[PDB]
Amino acid sequence: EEEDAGLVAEAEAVAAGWMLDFLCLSLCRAFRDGRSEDFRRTRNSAEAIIHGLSSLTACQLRTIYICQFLTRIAAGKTLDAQFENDERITPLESALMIWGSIEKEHDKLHEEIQNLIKIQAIAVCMENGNFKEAEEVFERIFGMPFKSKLLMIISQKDTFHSFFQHFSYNHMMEKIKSYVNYVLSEKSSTFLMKAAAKVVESKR
Amino acid sequence: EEEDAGLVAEAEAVAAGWMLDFLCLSLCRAFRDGRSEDFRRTRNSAEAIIHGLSSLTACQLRTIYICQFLTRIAAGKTLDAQFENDERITPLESALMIWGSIEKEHDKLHEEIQNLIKIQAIAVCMENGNFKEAEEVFERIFGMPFKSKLLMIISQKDTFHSFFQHFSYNHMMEKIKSYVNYVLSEKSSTFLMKAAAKVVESKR
Ligand SMILES: [Ca+2]
Ligand SMILES: [Ca+2]
């Protein structure tokens, strides 16, 4: 009986890992497509399956990080959203922390997304008239030329500036979508999605 | 592009159906074993996957009903839990409504579980000192000999009675667990669980 219970728990862990990969692929697709409601529902499903997983492989941690990163980016303009125990950390700052934690290549695209998130983390505060919060976000992020221009913009208390239109929220989203395309290609061959696709194709 | 999006949505529906069956099996096992925390976490996962399903087969509706029924039975003593739009309906009354809706055989076990839920729906109100609510539950349920004894017990305002010790909450749970064993046997051959079990066995 105890041996059977042990084998059953192991089988549940295997199935949960397959569900995590499928839900990550679905979340990536909803993010890339801009399907907001599908993204919300898939986020709910991914969070629940994650709470049922105990021990994680390095790949499973990476998959969870990718899900957490996309969730924070989708909430980047929601300054009332608290993703960290420290209530001062804004959603884009939380996304930056995960982006720097993922075991992935630090290629040119990685650094471009990183710098666009840093700029937008300040921009979103400015756009809401939260000037003191923009200065606090600036101090945490940098804790020279790029930094100096940002501080000057914050000091000018301009709710809008040409610099943010050049390094825009849309530009950040498009660069992140380029990265999401690579994750989609890499996880499209995962077990559950492959099996489901074969069934759908078999009925054509 | 639209054809690809259509095939992807169909594949997601196939995968969601497989996840629903696996989560139902896991919920049944947690209920049978009395693993309260695993039941809560699996309930959360099942609810999320269900919200991602649109069109349902008759079997998928039955599976959802089985999940909903077990959730109400697990919450049978939680009189603050509201499962229906009508806030007056108690959890055991909600379980009775689903039990009468499931497309299943009405064998002797079916009627025994039905009658034990009717008795306990009144008993749980009595045990909390909710005498007027017990009389209201009685009126909704019956809306002769068994009914007459129950009304007399409610009128005597006895928070405890030998009848409820004979037709007890534990007896209701044990009869329901006998039914859950049949559901477990029937759904153990579902795709995700079979594939996960084969992997675990392959590594032995
Ligand atoms: Ca805030
Ligand atoms: Ca109540």
Swiss-Prot record, chains A, B:
One of its GO terms (molecular function) is DNA binding. It comes from Homo sapiens (Human). Disulfide bonds: none annotated. This is Telomeric repeat-binding factor 1. Keywords: Acetylation, ADP-ribosylation, Cell cycle, Cell division, Chromosome, Cytoplasm, Cytoskeleton, DNA-binding, Isopeptide bond, Mitosis, Nucleus, Phosphoprotein, Telomere, Ubl conjugation. Changing residue 155 to D/E: Fails to induce apoptosis and decreases radiation hypersensitivity of ataxia-telangiectasia cells (phospho-mimicking mutants). The gene is TERF1. GO terms for biological process: cell division; meiotic telomere clustering; negative regulation of DNA replication; negative regulation of establishment of protein localization to telomere; negative regulation of establishment of protein-containing complex localization to telomere; negative regulation of establishment of RNA localization to telomere; negative regulation of telomere maintenance via semi-conservative replication; negative regulation of telomere maintenance via telomerase. Phosphorylated preferentially on Ser-155 in an ATM-dependent manner in response to ionizing DNA damage. ADP-ribosylation by TNKS1 or TNKS2 diminishes its ability to bind to telomeric DNA. Highly expressed and ubiquitous. Isoform Pin2 predominates.
